[PDB]
């Protein structure tokens, strides 16, 4: 669990990846599509988390807690990763590729689009690799609500794992440390986006623009 090799950590995380889900082929229809999607993705996220090494060793109280804190951060970094190849567009689903101006269709949304697009652009300038992505995402799950010793040990091994990937890519020590920092400073911006997204999703829940599922409702209320 804590005695996985670096490659076993990478293998296990790549193995646990959720599927990419699809959408269906105005402000109410676009919020409908997005929230319907997130709801279905959330169910796949619950199962992915239990496959994140160390996660099922925690009590269920803590498991709930970390997922509630982190879930939108997790959707968003997934979203950004999918969009990396599509400068100026967000690949919510393979049949739901939204370019920047479609964010204007929803009140308040275009500013969150811009933050997401800037992050994707950042992944692109870093040339983020998929192995690094699955690490960052696991880090978000275990880090984001961690303060609200075993999980600090799991976090250390994921850091070990990121470094291993960078060493394996032939990066020097100085470059490994520099990239590790660049990668982790991005989690700060994803936290920011999550907090703003949460505030936007809540304003929509109160305005009754869209029907939201029970799961989605409870994930929003934890904040």
């Amino acid at each position: 669990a804590l005695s996985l090799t670096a490659d076993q950590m990478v293998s296990a995380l790549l193995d646990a990846e959720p599927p990419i889900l699809y959408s269906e082929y105005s402000e109410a229809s676009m919020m409908g599509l997005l929230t319907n999607l997130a709801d279905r993705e959330l169910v796949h996220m619950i199962n992915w988390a239990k496959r994140v090494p160390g996660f099922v060793d925690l009590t269920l109280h803590d498991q709930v807690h970390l997922l509630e804190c982190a879930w939108l951060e997790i959707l968003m970094i997934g979203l950004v990763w999918r969009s990396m190849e599509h400068p100026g567009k967000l690949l919510f689903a393979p049949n739901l590729l939204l370019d920047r101006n479609q964010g204007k269709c929803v009140e308040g949304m275009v500013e969150i689009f811009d933050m997401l697009l800037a992050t994707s652009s950042r992944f692109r300038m870093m040339n983020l690799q998929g192995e690094e992505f699955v690490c960052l995402k696991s880090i978000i799950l275990l880090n984001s609500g961690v303060y609200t010793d075993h999980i600090h040990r799991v976090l250390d091994k994921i850091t070990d794992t990121l470094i291993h990937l960078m060493a394996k890519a032939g990066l020097t020590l100085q470059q490994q440390h520099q990239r590790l920092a660049q990668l982790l400073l991005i989690l700060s911006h994803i936290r920011h986006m999550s907090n703003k997204g949460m505030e936007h999703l809540y304003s929509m829940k109160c305005k009754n623009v869209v029907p939201l599922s029970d799961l989605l409702l409870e994930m929003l209320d934890a904040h």
Partner: peptide, 11 residues
Amino acid sequence: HKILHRLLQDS
């Protein structure tokens, strides 16, 4: 006895 809680233990 929240949703997420029992979903955390399925089959």
